[PDB]
Amino acid sequence: TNWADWIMGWRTPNASEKKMEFMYWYTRTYLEEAKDIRPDIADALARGMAGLAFGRTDWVASMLDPQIMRHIYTDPEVARIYSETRDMLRRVSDYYISLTTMELGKVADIIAEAKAKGENPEVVAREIAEAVPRLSPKSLYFNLYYIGRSIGDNYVLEVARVLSKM
């Protein structure tokens, strides 16, 4: 009925590696077979959701990849995964993530497109500020700082640094 409740259902104390990988595989295969999600996207979302289930921030990083998050705009099933898990995501980020689901998708697409074309991070920061007028550049900094550190993306961190000064 709801992705957060479903993720929470997999929780058991000190979940074994086998149990966690079973959850991941069940989720990935469901997304592929029942929702027709492309395998690379299904992998990332399943791993991210396993991260949310089992308290593994290194796994949550998989769904914070801009190349995955941008599909919020192209696939309603992906948008639904992000919206239904948003509270869990904000909790794991200690509320450094404050973007809405559709702002997150837009920011992801901007970053993905910009990085591929080698855009100056100064310009990308201004694109993001324009795309998300609801939040200040400082707020946007903390959002991208968290995302960039989580996924280990220095380009995202460069964009974040520009936002911090804007």
Side-chain angles (χ1 to χ4, degrees):
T1 185
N2 169 279
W3 281 107
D5 298 337
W6 192 82
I7 287 164
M8 294 280 181
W10 290 95
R11 296 192 167 176
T12 53
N14 310 129
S16 69
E17 282 182 42
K18 290 186 187 299
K19 178 63 169 188
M20 294 188 290
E21 291 309 302
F22 185 84
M23 180 277 177
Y24 158 80
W25 202 87
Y26 199 115
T27 307
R28 171 175 172 173
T29 309
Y30 174 81
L31 294 176
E32 292 164 352
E33 295 176 351
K35 303 301 198 179
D36 197 30
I37 291 174
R38 198 173 64 197
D40 63 328
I41 299 173
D43 169 48
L45 297 173
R47 183 58 61 187
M49 282 191 275
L52 293 172
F54 302 115
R56 287 284 292 272
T57 194
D58 57 320
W59 292 353
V60 177
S62 288
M63 75 191 303
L64 295 176
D65 179 352
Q67 288 291 356
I68 305 300
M69 293 191 300
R70 69 191 301 191
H71 293 282
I72 285 163
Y73 275 74
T74 61
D75 190 336
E77 297 286 358
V78 175
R80 182 187 163 210
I81 286 165
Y82 282 96
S83 65
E84 291 184 359
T85 63
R86 176 169 182 273
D87 289 349
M88 292 185 81
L89 181 58
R90 295 195 339 174
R91 199 172 326 118
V92 295
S93 76
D94 195 18
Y95 301 94
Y96 279 67
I97 295 175
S98 64
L99 291 152
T100 65
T101 298
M102 303 310 293
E103 290 166 352
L104 187 63
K106 178 54 178 177
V107 167
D109 197 70
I110 288 167
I111 291 167
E113 286 292 323
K115 195 199 294 181
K117 303 291 180 177
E119 182 59 274
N120 181 351
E122 287 270 350
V123 176
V124 181
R126 290 167 170 72
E127 296 182 64
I128 288 171
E130 183 172 71
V132 192
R134 189 181 64 93
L135 300 181
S136 71
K138 193 73 71 173
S139 175
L140 290 162
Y141 161 61
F142 288 116
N143 277 270
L144 274 65
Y145 169 85
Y146 179 81
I147 290 166
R149 289 288 172 193
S150 173
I151 70 181
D153 190 320
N154 291 330
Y155 185 83
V156 172
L157 294 172
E158 286 187 67
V159 176
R161 291 197 201 89
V162 176
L163 289 162
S164 188
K165 296 193 182 81
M166 271 179 29

mmCIF file of all heavy atoms in Angstrom, residues 129-145:
data_model
loop_
_atom_site.group_PDB
_atom_site.id
_atom_site.type_symbol
_atom_site.label_atom_id
_atom_site.label_comp_id
_atom_site.label_asym_id
_atom_site.label_seq_id
_atom_site.Cartn_x
_atom_site.Cartn_y
_atom_site.Cartn_z
ATOM 1 N N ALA A 129 19.199 27.481 -7.936
ATOM 2 C CA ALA A 129 18.531 28.548 -7.194
ATOM 3 C C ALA A 129 17.268 29.007 -7.933
ATOM 4 O O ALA A 129 16.234 29.242 -7.323
ATOM 5 C CB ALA A 129 19.480 29.716 -6.958
ATOM 6 N N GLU A 130 17.350 29.108 -9.256
ATOM 7 C CA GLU A 130 16.197 29.494 -10.062
ATOM 8 C C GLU A 130 15.100 28.420 -10.064
ATOM 9 O O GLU A 130 13.910 28.743 -10.076
ATOM 10 C CB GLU A 130 16.647 29.779 -11.490
ATOM 11 C CG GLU A 130 15.567 30.247 -12.404
ATOM 12 C CD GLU A 130 16.146 30.689 -13.722
ATOM 13 O OE1 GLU A 130 16.600 29.809 -14.482
ATOM 14 O OE2 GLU A 130 16.183 31.906 -13.967
ATOM 15 N N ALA A 131 15.513 27.154 -10.055
ATOM 16 C CA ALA A 131 14.578 26.031 -10.115
ATOM 17 C C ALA A 131 13.834 25.802 -8.805
ATOM 18 O O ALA A 131 12.750 25.225 -8.812
ATOM 19 C CB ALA A 131 15.313 24.762 -10.520
ATOM 20 N N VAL A 132 14.429 26.232 -7.691
ATOM 21 C CA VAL A 132 13.875 25.977 -6.360
ATOM 22 C C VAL A 132 13.763 27.289 -5.576
ATOM 23 O O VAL A 132 14.462 27.503 -4.579
ATOM 24 C CB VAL A 132 14.711 24.935 -5.573
ATOM 25 C CG1 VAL A 132 13.951 24.474 -4.332
ATOM 26 C CG2 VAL A 132 15.058 23.738 -6.462
ATOM 27 N N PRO A 133 12.866 28.180 -6.024
ATOM 28 C CA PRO A 133 12.707 29.469 -5.349
ATOM 29 C C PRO A 133 12.178 29.374 -3.911
ATOM 30 O O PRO A 133 12.348 30.315 -3.141
ATOM 31 C CB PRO A 133 11.709 30.209 -6.245
ATOM 32 C CG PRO A 133 10.966 29.117 -6.944
ATOM 33 C CD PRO A 133 11.972 28.057 -7.189
ATOM 34 N N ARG A 134 11.550 28.253 -3.552
ATOM 35 C CA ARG A 134 11.009 28.050 -2.206
ATOM 36 C C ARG A 134 12.091 28.039 -1.126
ATOM 37 O O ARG A 134 11.821 28.395 0.023
ATOM 38 C CB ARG A 134 10.217 26.735 -2.159
ATOM 39 C CG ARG A 134 9.423 26.489 -0.886
ATOM 40 C CD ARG A 134 8.686 25.149 -0.937
ATOM 41 N NE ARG A 134 9.641 24.047 -1.004
ATOM 42 C CZ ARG A 134 10.128 23.374 0.039
ATOM 43 N NH1 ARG A 134 9.726 23.626 1.280
ATOM 44 N NH2 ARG A 134 11.022 22.415 -0.164
ATOM 45 N N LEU A 135 13.302 27.619 -1.493
ATOM 46 C CA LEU A 135 14.407 27.481 -0.548
ATOM 47 C C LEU A 135 15.492 28.502 -0.836
ATOM 48 O O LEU A 135 15.732 28.849 -1.984
ATOM 49 C CB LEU A 135 15.007 26.083 -0.643
ATOM 50 C CG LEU A 135 14.071 24.918 -0.336
ATOM 51 C CD1 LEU A 135 14.818 23.589 -0.455
ATOM 52 C CD2 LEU A 135 13.453 25.073 1.047
ATOM 53 N N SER A 136 16.162 28.964 0.216
ATOM 54 C CA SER A 136 17.280 29.888 0.061
ATOM 55 C C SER A 136 18.499 29.156 -0.499
ATOM 56 O O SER A 136 18.592 27.941 -0.396
ATOM 57 C CB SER A 136 17.661 30.490 1.408
ATOM 58 O OG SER A 136 18.272 29.513 2.234
ATOM 59 N N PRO A 137 19.462 29.905 -1.060
ATOM 60 C CA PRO A 137 20.702 29.264 -1.482
ATOM 61 C C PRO A 137 21.411 28.528 -0.340
ATOM 62 O O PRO A 137 21.973 27.466 -0.569
ATOM 63 C CB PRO A 137 21.534 30.431 -2.012
ATOM 64 C CG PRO A 137 20.515 31.394 -2.508
ATOM 65 C CD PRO A 137 19.389 31.305 -1.515
ATOM 66 N N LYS A 138 21.366 29.066 0.879
ATOM 67 C CA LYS A 138 21.966 28.366 2.025
ATOM 68 C C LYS A 138 21.257 27.046 2.312
ATOM 69 O O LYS A 138 21.910 26.045 2.596
ATOM 70 C CB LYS A 138 21.985 29.238 3.287
ATOM 71 C CG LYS A 138 22.880 28.684 4.402
ATOM 72 C CD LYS A 138 24.381 28.854 4.095
ATOM 73 C CE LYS A 138 24.807 30.309 4.182
ATOM 74 N NZ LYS A 138 26.278 30.481 4.047
ATOM 75 N N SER A 139 19.929 27.038 2.233
ATOM 76 C CA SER A 139 19.183 25.792 2.403
ATOM 77 C C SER A 139 19.595 24.805 1.324
ATOM 78 O O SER A 139 19.844 23.626 1.588
ATOM 79 C CB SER A 139 17.678 26.028 2.330
ATOM 80 O OG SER A 139 16.985 24.798 2.393
ATOM 81 N N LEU A 140 19.667 25.297 0.096
ATOM 82 C CA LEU A 140 20.038 24.454 -1.022
ATOM 83 C C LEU A 140 21.458 23.903 -0.854
ATOM 84 O O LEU A 140 21.713 22.758 -1.199
ATOM 85 C CB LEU A 140 19.883 25.222 -2.338
ATOM 86 C CG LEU A 140 18.430 25.516 -2.729
ATOM 87 C CD1 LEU A 140 18.355 26.626 -3.773
ATOM 88 C CD2 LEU A 140 17.722 24.248 -3.215
ATOM 89 N N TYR A 141 22.364 24.712 -0.307
ATOM 90 C CA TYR A 141 23.703 24.247 0.051
ATOM 91 C C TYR A 141 23.655 23.017 0.947
ATOM 92 O O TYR A 141 24.311 22.018 0.668
ATOM 93 C CB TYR A 141 24.501 25.357 0.743
ATOM 94 C CG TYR A 141 25.685 24.871 1.538
ATOM 95 C CD1 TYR A 141 26.733 24.193 0.924
ATOM 96 C CD2 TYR A 141 25.777 25.111 2.904
ATOM 97 C CE1 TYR A 141 27.825 23.754 1.642
ATOM 98 C CE2 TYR A 141 26.868 24.678 3.633
ATOM 99 C CZ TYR A 141 27.892 23.997 3.000
ATOM 100 O OH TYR A 141 28.979 23.565 3.732
ATOM 101 N N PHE A 142 22.896 23.088 2.034
ATOM 102 C CA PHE A 142 22.865 21.966 2.974
ATOM 103 C C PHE A 142 22.261 20.711 2.346
ATOM 104 O O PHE A 142 22.714 19.603 2.626
ATOM 105 C CB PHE A 142 22.150 22.340 4.277
ATOM 106 C CG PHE A 142 22.949 23.278 5.137
ATOM 107 C CD1 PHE A 142 22.491 24.561 5.421
ATOM 108 C CD2 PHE A 142 24.185 22.889 5.642
ATOM 109 C CE1 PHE A 142 23.245 25.428 6.199
ATOM 110 C CE2 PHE A 142 24.943 23.756 6.410
ATOM 111 C CZ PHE A 142 24.471 25.030 6.687
ATOM 112 N N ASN A 143 21.262 20.893 1.487
ATOM 113 C CA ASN A 143 20.706 19.781 0.731
ATOM 114 C C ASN A 143 21.775 19.110 -0.126
ATOM 115 O O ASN A 143 21.959 17.899 -0.075
ATOM 116 C CB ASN A 143 19.562 20.254 -0.180
ATOM 117 C CG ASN A 143 18.234 20.353 0.539
ATOM 118 O OD1 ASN A 143 17.472 19.391 0.576
ATOM 119 N ND2 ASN A 143 17.950 21.513 1.120
ATOM 120 N N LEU A 144 22.479 19.911 -0.923
ATOM 121 C CA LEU A 144 23.458 19.354 -1.858
ATOM 122 C C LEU A 144 24.736 18.889 -1.167
ATOM 123 O O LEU A 144 25.398 17.976 -1.656
ATOM 124 C CB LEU A 144 23.794 20.348 -2.967
ATOM 125 C CG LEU A 144 22.864 20.348 -4.181
ATOM 126 C CD1 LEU A 144 21.451 20.785 -3.831
ATOM 127 C CD2 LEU A 144 23.457 21.238 -5.257
ATOM 128 N N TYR A 145 25.088 19.528 -0.055
ATOM 129 C CA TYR A 145 26.214 19.088 0.772
ATOM 130 C C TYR A 145 25.958 17.670 1.259
ATOM 131 O O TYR A 145 26.820 16.792 1.155
ATOM 132 C CB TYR A 145 26.413 20.047 1.956
ATOM 133 C CG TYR A 145 27.371 19.561 3.022
ATOM 134 C CD1 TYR A 145 28.739 19.765 2.900
ATOM 135 C CD2 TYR A 145 26.902 18.914 4.165
ATOM 136 C CE1 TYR A 145 29.621 19.324 3.891
ATOM 137 C CE2 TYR A 145 27.772 18.464 5.155
ATOM 138 C CZ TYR A 145 29.129 18.676 5.014
ATOM 139 O OH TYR A 145 29.987 18.235 5.998
#
